[PDB]
Amino acid sequence: NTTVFQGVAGQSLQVSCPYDSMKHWGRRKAWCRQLGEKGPCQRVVSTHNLWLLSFLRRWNGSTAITDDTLGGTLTITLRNLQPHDAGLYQCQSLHGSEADTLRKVLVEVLADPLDHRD
Amino acid sequence: NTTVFQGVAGQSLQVSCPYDSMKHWGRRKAWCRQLGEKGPCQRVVSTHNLWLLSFLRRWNGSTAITDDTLGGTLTITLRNLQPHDAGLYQCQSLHGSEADTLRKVLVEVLADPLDHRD
Amino acid sequence: NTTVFQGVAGQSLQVSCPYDSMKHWGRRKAWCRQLGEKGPCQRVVSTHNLWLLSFLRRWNGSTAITDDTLGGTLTITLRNLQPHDAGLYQCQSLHGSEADTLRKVLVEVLADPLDHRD
Amino acid sequence: NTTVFQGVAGQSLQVSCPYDSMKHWGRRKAWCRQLGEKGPCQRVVSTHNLWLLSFLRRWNGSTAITDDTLGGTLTITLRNLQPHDAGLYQCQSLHGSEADTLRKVLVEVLADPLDHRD
Amino acid sequence: EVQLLESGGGLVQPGGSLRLSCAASGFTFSYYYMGWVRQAPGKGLEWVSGISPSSGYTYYADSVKGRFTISRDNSKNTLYLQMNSLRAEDTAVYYCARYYYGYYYSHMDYWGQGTLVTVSSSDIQMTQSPSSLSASVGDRVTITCRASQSISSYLNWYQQKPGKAPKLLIYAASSLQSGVPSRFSGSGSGTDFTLTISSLQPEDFATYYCQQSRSGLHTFGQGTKLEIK
Amino acid sequence: EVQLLESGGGLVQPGGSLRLSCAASGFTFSYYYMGWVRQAPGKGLEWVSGISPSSGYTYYADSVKGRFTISRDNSKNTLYLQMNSLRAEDTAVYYCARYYYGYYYSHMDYWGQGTLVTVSSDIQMTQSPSSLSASVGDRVTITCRASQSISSYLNWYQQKPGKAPKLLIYAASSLQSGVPSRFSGSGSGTDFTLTISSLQPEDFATYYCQQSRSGLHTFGQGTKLEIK
Amino acid sequence: EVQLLESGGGLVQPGGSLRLSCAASGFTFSYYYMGWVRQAPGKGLEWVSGISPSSGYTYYADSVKGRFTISRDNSKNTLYLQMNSLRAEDTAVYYCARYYYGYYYSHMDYWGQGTLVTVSSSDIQMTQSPSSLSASVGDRVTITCRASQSISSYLNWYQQKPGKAPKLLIYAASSLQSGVPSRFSGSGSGTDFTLTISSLQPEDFATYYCQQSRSGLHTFGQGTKLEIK
Amino acid sequence: EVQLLESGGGLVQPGGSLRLSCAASGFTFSYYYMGWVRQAPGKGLEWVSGISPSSGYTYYADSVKGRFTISRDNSKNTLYLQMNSLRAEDTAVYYCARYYYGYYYSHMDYWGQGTLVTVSSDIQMTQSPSSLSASVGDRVTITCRASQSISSYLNWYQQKPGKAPKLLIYAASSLQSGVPSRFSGSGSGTDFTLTISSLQPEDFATYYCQQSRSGLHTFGQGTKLEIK
Ligand SMILES: *[C@@H]1O[C@H](CO)[C@@H](O)[C@H](O)[C@H]1NC(C)=O
Ligand SMILES: *[C@@H]1O[C@H](CO)[C@@H](O)[C@H](O)[C@H]1NC(C)=O
Ligand SMILES: *[C@@H]1O[C@H](CO)[C@@H](O)[C@H](O)[C@H]1NC(C)=O
Ligand SMILES: *[C@@H]1O[C@H](CO)[C@@H](O)[C@H](O)[C@H]1NC(C)=O
Known part of the structure; x- marks a missing residue:
C-alpha cells in the first residue's frame, strides 16, 4: 500500500512518514530510492548518527531529513523537485543490520504550468 | 516581488520564508492574507507569544506556523489545501506597532490530477 | 552514596545531577528534600509539565530547576542559601507512578567568612 | 566596585554577570583573569564565535562560559575549584578591537573542611 | 501599464461557433485568475466564466448551460473563450477581466474594452x-x-x-x-x-x-x- | 495479473491519421508512467513516447516529435497514441508498455501484445x-x-x-x-x-x-x- | 555499626573546667551535624549544643549562659564539649548524639552512652x-x-x-x-x-x-x- | 592611601613567644591575601607565611612550619603572626605585606614599615x-x-x-x-x-x-x- 505525494517541479516537496514512536524508539531513520521490484533501494540520506540529535536536519544534495522522535513523525524534504526525482521511495527504521519499512512513498512530479518570465 | 508556492488540492502546502535572523532578532512573526492591493492583510496566525518558544507550532484552523529564529526561516503549513486558499499572503516580522514584510507569497492551488480509486 | 555540595550562606548554590539521557528519555525530573531515612522526601519542585520544554526554569520559592535532556544533566539552584537549607535531597526521574533516584545530594551550608563592610 | 564569589575547593563555582541586553546586543562576551593592577587580563574563554550561538557552552580546561543574550546574563563555570583559581577576573563585552568591562569578579576559594574518607 | 485587448467578435449565425481571444500585457499573466463578463445591449453585466492560472479550475455561469469553454495560454499571455451553439441571448459585448491574486474572495481589478458578438437572424442571487x-x-x-x-x-x-x-x-x-x-x-x-x-x-x-x-x-x-x- | 492490450491498428493511407488504444488491468494505472514502443518488420525496437501519470510530462522520439500525441485516461485505465501525418516508415507493430514507478532511471516491466499498423503505398x-x-x-x-x-x-x-x-x-x-x-x-x-x-x-x-x-x-x- | 563513645567525665570542683570528648565510628563523621544532651540525676533531658559539619554554625542552650564551647575534629572523627566555670547544676550525664543529615527540621538518630560529670562541694517552650x-x-x-x-x-x-x-x-x-x-x-x-x-x-x-x-x-x-x- | 603598620616586636629570650600585629587601612582588608616577610640583619629577604581572606588557607616557610601561626581579624583590619619557640635565627625585621587579589601567580604590592624582633643570647x-x-x-x-x-x-x-x-x-x-x-x-x-x-x-x-x-x-x- 503506497502513499502518493505530488509536487510541482521547482518547488520543495515535503514527505511525512508517521510511525509508532514507542515501537521504533532509539532507532535512526533512513530515506532510500527503490529502483525496481527487486531493488536496490539506494540510500539517499539518514538521520543523525546520534539518535538524541535526530531533530537536526541532515542533507545529501537537495534532499534533507529530520525526525520527531517524540511525536513519531519523519520528515523528508526534496528541495527543487526535478522530473527525475519521480519514483518510489522508502521510509526506513534502522536497528543493527536490519531495516524496517515505515512507508512506501511514490513521488509524482507535476510540470510547472506557470511562465515566470518578467 | 511575489514568490509563488504551488500545491495540490487535498495535500498540505509548506511555505518557507527565510529572513536575516540578526536583523529580525527578538521579533515574533505573523502570516496574513492580503485581499487586495490596498489591504486588508487579514491576520491568520502568529508565532508563540514568547519569542523564546518560537519553535512551537501555533495553529489557526488548518494553518500552522513555526519559526526557526536561529537559521532564520519561517515556515507556514496549509493543511488540506483547497481551491479557496489561493491568493496572496504576507510573511511579517513584528516589532511594537510595526510590521515588516518578509515575503509576499502567492499560493496557487492545482487540482489533483490523479485517480486514487485504486 | 551521598554527594556533598557545599555553599556559602547568602550566595546561590547550584546542584548538578548527571544522568543517562537515553535511559531516562522522555521522563520529567523532580527535586525533593529527605527529612529522614524512612522519608518523607518532600517534593520541592519539578520540571515543566511538557517534557519537550524541560529546559524552561521552574520555580518554587527560592528553588529553581532546569533540565538538559540532551546532555543528560539536571540542575537545581538554591537562591539565597540559608543554614536551614542544609540536609539531604534527592534528584528523581519520574515515570508514571514511579520515581528513580538519580542522585542523593547533601547540601552543606558554610557561614560567610568575609566582612563585606567595605 | 568588585563583586566577590566564594566557592569551596573541589566544588564547581558559578559566576553570573548580568548586563543590559540591549546596550550589549550583538556583542560576544569574554572571561579573563587579571594578574595585576596594570594587567594582563589573560583571556581564559569567550562565547561562541557566532553570536546567535551564544547559548552554547564553550570550554577551556575546567572553565566554561555560556551567555543568555535574551535576559542579559553571562554565566561562568569554574569546575573543580582549586586554590590557585583565587584572584580577580573580568566579565567583558567585545566589539571590534574594544572590550568593555561588565563586572570585576573576585573569586575566593574556601578550604574543604570535610574529610571524605570512607 | 496593465493592458487587456479582446478580439474575435463579429457577426455569426444562430447555432454557429466563435472563439474570442484576449491579449494581456503589463503583468505576469501566469499568476492571476482570469475571467469573462458579457453585457447584452441595454442590459446589465453578466459574469460568464473564470479560470485558474494552471487551467485546473474552470467556472461557468449556469445560464450558459455548458456551451462555453474557457482556456488560457500562459506562454503567450492570452485568454480564450470558446462559444458553441450560439443563440440570440448570446449577443453581447464580451469583456476580458483580470482577478487580483486569487479567485474566491477576490475581485476583477482590470478590464479589457470588450468585443461585440452579434448573433443574427453556489447559486447566490x-x-x-x-x-x-x-x-x-x-x-x-x-x-x-x-x-x-x-x-x-x-x-x-x-x-x-x-x-x-x-x-x-x-x-x-x-x-x-x-x-x-x-x-x-x-x-x-x-x-x-x-x-x-x-x-x-x-x-x-x-x-x-x-x-x-x-x-x-x-x-x-x-x-x-x-x-x- | 497485470495485463495490457492494444487496439486500433490497421491499414492507413500516407498522410492519414490513426489512434491507438491500450487497455490496462491489474495495477493502479494512474500511478505509473506509460510508453509506446514500435517495431518495423525485420527491424529492431524503436522507443516512441512516454507520458507521466498526470499527463503533464510527455516525451517523444525525434522521428515522431510533432506528429504523434500520447495521452491517457486514468479513470478508464487506458493509454492512447494519436498518430498524424503517417509515413511509410511508420509501418510497425506498436507495443504498449508500463514503466516501473518513475521514468528517469526506470524500466518498462510490463508489455502489451502489440498491434499492427500498415501505411500503404541524444544518446546513441x-x-x-x-x-x-x-x-x-x-x-x-x-x-x-x-x-x-x-x-x-x-x-x-x-x-x-x-x-x-x-x-x-x-x-x-x-x-x-x-x-x-x-x-x-x-x-x-x-x-x-x-x-x-x-x-x-x-x-x-x-x-x-x-x-x-x-x-x-x-x-x-x-x-x-x-x-x- | 554506628558507634558513639563519650569520655572525659569525672569529679570536678565548682568553678573548674572540663573537656568532654566523643569518638565516632561507622559513618562519615564529616557529613553530619553533631550535638550534646545532658541529664541531671532524677531530671529530664536537656539539649545542650549543636555544631555544623564545617564548625561554622554552633548553637547553645540559653541555660548554659555561654559557658560552653562545642567543637569537632573531622580528620579524627571526634566531637568535643568544653565546659567552663562549672556549677552544681552542671552535674549530669552528658550524651553525644548524631543528627540525621541537616540540623533544622532534623532529629538525633544515634546516641552515645553518656559520661558522668559530678561537680563537688527561637526560645520555644x-x-x-x-x-x-x-x-x-x-x-x-x-x-x-x-x-x-x-x-x-x-x-x-x-x-x-x-x-x-x-x-x-x-x-x-x-x-x-x-x-x-x-x-x-x-x-x-x-x-x-x-x-x-x-x-x-x-x-x-x-x-x-x-x-x-x-x-x-x-x-x-x-x-x-x-x-x- | 594604603597603609600597613606593624607592632609587637622587641627583645625576647630563646624559647619564648611573641605575637606581631599589623594594622591595615585604605583598602577592603577582607578581600586580600596577606603575608609576612622577615630580614635578618645583613641578610636577604625571607618569606615567612601567607593567609587567605577566609583564614582557611595558611602557608608557612619550612624554617617556621609548626612554630609560627598566622591569623587575621577582618573586622579589625588586622593581621597577626604568633611566634613560638623562638630561636636566635628568628632575629629579624618582620614586614607585613598585602597580596594583590589572589595568591598563586600574584605579588606583594604593599608593604609595612617593619618591626624588629631580637632573640637574645621546594623551588630554589x-x-x-x-x-x-x-x-x-x-x-x-x-x-x-x-x-x-x-x-x-x-x-x-x-x-x-x-x-x-x-x-x-x-x-x-x-x-x-x-x-x-x-x-x-x-x-x-x-x-x-x-x-x-x-x-x-x-x-x-x-x-x-x-x-x-x-x-x-x-x-x-x-x-x-x-x-x-
Ligand atoms: C546521496 O544519495 C545518493 C543516491 O541518490 C548516494 O549514492 C550517495 O551515496 C548519498 N550521499 C551520501 C553522503 O550518503
Ligand atoms: C484565524 O484566522 C481567521 C481568518 O483570517 C481570523 O478571522 C481569526 O481572527 C484568526 N484567529 C486567531 C486566533 O488569530
Ligand atoms: C514548594 O515546596 C514546598 C516545601 O516542600 C511544598 O510544601 C510545596 O508543595 C511546593 N510547591 C509546589 C507547587 O510544588
Ligand atoms: C585557556 O586559558 C589560558 C589562561 O588560563 C590561556 O592561556 C589559553 O590560551 C586558553 N585557551 C584557549 C584555547 O583559549
Whole structure:
C-alpha cells in the first residue's frame, strides 16, 4: 500500500512518514530510492548518527531529513523537485543490520504550468 | 516581488520564508492574507507569544506556523489545501506597532490530477 | 552514596545531577528534600509539565530547576542559601507512578567568612 | 566596585554577570583573569564565535562560559575549584578591537573542611 | 501599464461557433485568475466564466448551460473563450477581466474594452435597490445590494460609465481600490451591503453593479442607473 | 495479473491519421508512467513516447516529435497514441508498455501484445555483435555501448520470435522478478554487458539494451542469438 | 555499626573546667551535624549544643549562659564539649548524639552512652502532659506535647529506658524511625502533638521526651514517665 | 592611601613567644591575601607565611612550619603572626605585606614599615650576580634562576638602604603602578632578567626576585647594586 505525494517541479516537496514512536524508539531513520521490484533501494540520506540529535536536519544534495522522535513523525524534504526525482521511495527504521519499512512513498512530479518570465 | 508556492488540492502546502535572523532578532512573526492591493492583510496566525518558544507550532484552523529564529526561516503549513486558499499572503516580522514584510507569497492551488480509486 | 555540595550562606548554590539521557528519555525530573531515612522526601519542585520544554526554569520559592535532556544533566539552584537549607535531597526521574533516584545530594551550608563592610 | 564569589575547593563555582541586553546586543562576551593592577587580563574563554550561538557552552580546561543574550546574563563555570583559581577576573563585552568591562569578579576559594574518607 | 485587448467578435449565425481571444500585457499573466463578463445591449453585466492560472479550475455561469469553454495560454499571455451553439441571448459585448491574486474572495481589478458578438437572424442571487435613481451633483447617494444567502464581506462594486468598460471601485465590501476617488465607500457584511458616494461629481452619473465572490460563480447584481435629476 | 492490450491498428493511407488504444488491468494505472514502443518488420525496437501519470510530462522520439500525441485516461485505465501525418516508415507493430514507478532511471516491466499498423503505398546505443551463433550450454556475453555516460541506467530486454519484448535486467545489474538467474548484467558509464551463464533452448532470441538516463529511452539495434 | 563513645567525665570542683570528648565510628563523621544532651540525676533531658559539619554554625542552650564551647575534629572523627566555670547544676550525664543529615527540621538518630560529670562541694517552650502515667501491658497509650509557638511538623519523640541512653522513635511528627517497632506512631502539626503506643509491651515502660527542631535550639519537653499500673 | 603598620616586636629570650600585629587601612582588608616577610640583619629577604581572606588557607616557610601561626581579624583590619619557640635565627625585621587579589601567580604590592624582633643570647631561587658595581646612566641586567619551571610567575622587588621592600615587576614583565618605566623584566620557565635601562642615583639598592607559582613564595638571595 503506497502513499502518493505530488509536487510541482521547482518547488520543495515535503514527505511525512508517521510511525509508532514507542515501537521504533532509539532507532535512526533512513530515506532510500527503490529502483525496481527487486531493488536496490539506494540510500539517499539518514538521520543523525546520534539518535538524541535526530531533530537536526541532515542533507545529501537537495534532499534533507529530520525526525520527531517524540511525536513519531519523519520528515523528508526534496528541495527543487526535478522530473527525475519521480519514483518510489522508502521510509526506513534502522536497528543493527536490519531495516524496517515505515512507508512506501511514490513521488509524482507535476510540470510547472506557470511562465515566470518578467 | 511575489514568490509563488504551488500545491495540490487535498495535500498540505509548506511555505518557507527565510529572513536575516540578526536583523529580525527578538521579533515574533505573523502570516496574513492580503485581499487586495490596498489591504486588508487579514491576520491568520502568529508565532508563540514568547519569542523564546518560537519553535512551537501555533495553529489557526488548518494553518500552522513555526519559526526557526536561529537559521532564520519561517515556515507556514496549509493543511488540506483547497481551491479557496489561493491568493496572496504576507510573511511579517513584528516589532511594537510595526510590521515588516518578509515575503509576499502567492499560493496557487492545482487540482489533483490523479485517480486514487485504486 | 551521598554527594556533598557545599555553599556559602547568602550566595546561590547550584546542584548538578548527571544522568543517562537515553535511559531516562522522555521522563520529567523532580527535586525533593529527605527529612529522614524512612522519608518523607518532600517534593520541592519539578520540571515543566511538557517534557519537550524541560529546559524552561521552574520555580518554587527560592528553588529553581532546569533540565538538559540532551546532555543528560539536571540542575537545581538554591537562591539565597540559608543554614536551614542544609540536609539531604534527592534528584528523581519520574515515570508514571514511579520515581528513580538519580542522585542523593547533601547540601552543606558554610557561614560567610568575609566582612563585606567595605 | 568588585563583586566577590566564594566557592569551596573541589566544588564547581558559578559566576553570573548580568548586563543590559540591549546596550550589549550583538556583542560576544569574554572571561579573563587579571594578574595585576596594570594587567594582563589573560583571556581564559569567550562565547561562541557566532553570536546567535551564544547559548552554547564553550570550554577551556575546567572553565566554561555560556551567555543568555535574551535576559542579559553571562554565566561562568569554574569546575573543580582549586586554590590557585583565587584572584580577580573580568566579565567583558567585545566589539571590534574594544572590550568593555561588565563586572570585576573576585573569586575566593574556601578550604574543604570535610574529610571524605570512607 | 496593465493592458487587456479582446478580439474575435463579429457577426455569426444562430447555432454557429466563435472563439474570442484576449491579449494581456503589463503583468505576469501566469499568476492571476482570469475571467469573462458579457453585457447584452441595454442590459446589465453578466459574469460568464473564470479560470485558474494552471487551467485546473474552470467556472461557468449556469445560464450558459455548458456551451462555453474557457482556456488560457500562459506562454503567450492570452485568454480564450470558446462559444458553441450560439443563440440570440448570446449577443453581447464580451469583456476580458483580470482577478487580483486569487479567485474566491477576490475581485476583477482590470478590464479589457470588450468585443461585440452579434448573433443574427453556489447559486447566490444578487438584487440591487433601486434599479434607477435620480440625483444631483453634490448629493449624497447610497445604493444597496442584497444577497440571497450570506457572503460575509466578499462583495465588490463596479462602475460603468456610458459607452465605457466597467471599472472596479470597492472590493471586500469596504476596501477602496487604488486610484479610485475617496468619495466612494462601501459597507456591509452577510447579506446587506451599501455603496456610498459622499458627494456626487459630474462624472459619477453611471450604472453601478455589485458582485459577490464568496462562491465560485461571481454573479453580478442587476445594476443601479444613476441619472441626472 | 497485470495485463495490457492494444487496439486500433490497421491499414492507413500516407498522410492519414490513426489512434491507438491500450487497455490496462491489474495495477493502479494512474500511478505509473506509460510508453509506446514500435517495431518495423525485420527491424529492431524503436522507443516512441512516454507520458507521466498526470499527463503533464510527455516525451517523444525525434522521428515522431510533432506528429504523434500520447495521452491517457486514468479513470478508464487506458493509454492512447494519436498518430498524424503517417509515413511509410511508420509501418510497425506498436507495443504498449508500463514503466516501473518513475521514468528517469526506470524500466518498462510490463508489455502489451502489440498491434499492427500498415501505411500503404541524444544518446546513441550500439550493440555488439549484431548476430551471434552459440550452442545450448554455452556462456554468452552481449555488449552495449552508449555514446555518452548513462551511469547505471541500462535495461536489457528479450524478444523471442513472434513474441512481445520482455524485461530481463534493469539498472544494469538487477535481475527482474521471475527472470531465470542465468541472466546477469554489468557495467557503468558507457560500456555494459549482458551475460547468459549457460544457454538454454528458449534463450535463442534477440536481445536489446535501453538507456533511461535521459528522457528519450532509446534502444540499441539488437543482437540476434542463433543456433550454431 | 554506628558507634558513639563519650569520655572525659569525672569529679570536678565548682568553678573548674572540663573537656568532654566523643569518638565516632561507622559513618562519615564529616557529613553530619553533631550535638550534646545532658541529664541531671532524677531530671529530664536537656539539649545542650549543636555544631555544623564545617564548625561554622554552633548553637547553645540559653541555660548554659555561654559557658560552653562545642567543637569537632573531622580528620579524627571526634566531637568535643568544653565546659567552663562549672556549677552544681552542671552535674549530669552528658550524651553525644548524631543528627540525621541537616540540623533544622532534623532529629538525633544515634546516641552515645553518656559520661558522668559530678561537680563537688527561637526560645520555644515544650510542655508534655501528663508528667506521669500508669498503664498496663497491652494498653493503648497516648502522650501529648504542646509547643508555645508553631513548629509545623518538626517534632521528635525519644524513649529512655531506666539506666539506658535515649533512643529515637518518631521524627518529623509522624515518621517511624528505622528499627523501631510499628506499635509506636506520632501525629500533630503546629502546636499540639501526640505520641501513641497502640498496644503496650513490657519493655515500653520508660520515659518519653518530645523535641522540636524548627528553631536552632532543640529543646526537649519535660518528659512523661510511663509506669506499671 | 594604603597603609600597613606593624607592632609587637622587641627583645625576647630563646624559647619564648611573641605575637606581631599589623594594622591595615585604605583598602577592603577582607578581600586580600596577606603575608609576612622577615630580614635578618645583613641578610636577604625571607618569606615567612601567607593567609587567605577566609583564614582557611595558611602557608608557612619550612624554617617556621609548626612554630609560627598566622591569623587575621577582618573586622579589625588586622593581621597577626604568633611566634613560638623562638630561636636566635628568628632575629629579624618582620614586614607585613598585602597580596594583590589572589595568591598563586600574584605579588606583594604593599608593604609595612617593619618591626624588629631580637632573640637574645621546594623551588630554589638563585640570583646572579650577588654584587654588581655600576655607574649612573649604565644599563644594568640582573638574573634570577629557578630550580624548576615557574612559568611567568616571578616578581622583582627593590630595597633601598634603610627602607622597606618595594615591588617593581610582577608576572615577569608587568610594570607595577607608579614604578619608573626604566625598569623592565623578562623570562619564562626558569631564567629571568631584571633590566634598568638607564641607572639613576636612587637605583643603587638591593634587588630580590620571588616566585609565586607554588604556595611558598621564596625570594632569591638578592643582588646588591653599588656605585662603581
Ligand atoms: C546521496 O544519495 C545518493 C543516491 O541518490 C548516494 O549514492 C550517495 O551515496 C548519498 N550521499 C551520501 C553522503 O550518503
Ligand atoms: C484565524 O484566522 C481567521 C481568518 O483570517 C481570523 O478571522 C481569526 O481572527 C484568526 N484567529 C486567531 C486566533 O488569530
Ligand atoms: C514548594 O515546596 C514546598 C516545601 O516542600 C511544598 O510544601 C510545596 O508543595 C511546593 N510547591 C509546589 C507547587 O510544588
Ligand atoms: C585557556 O586559558 C589560558 C589562561 O588560563 C590561556 O592561556 C589559553 O590560551 C586558553 N585557551 C584557549 C584555547 O583559549
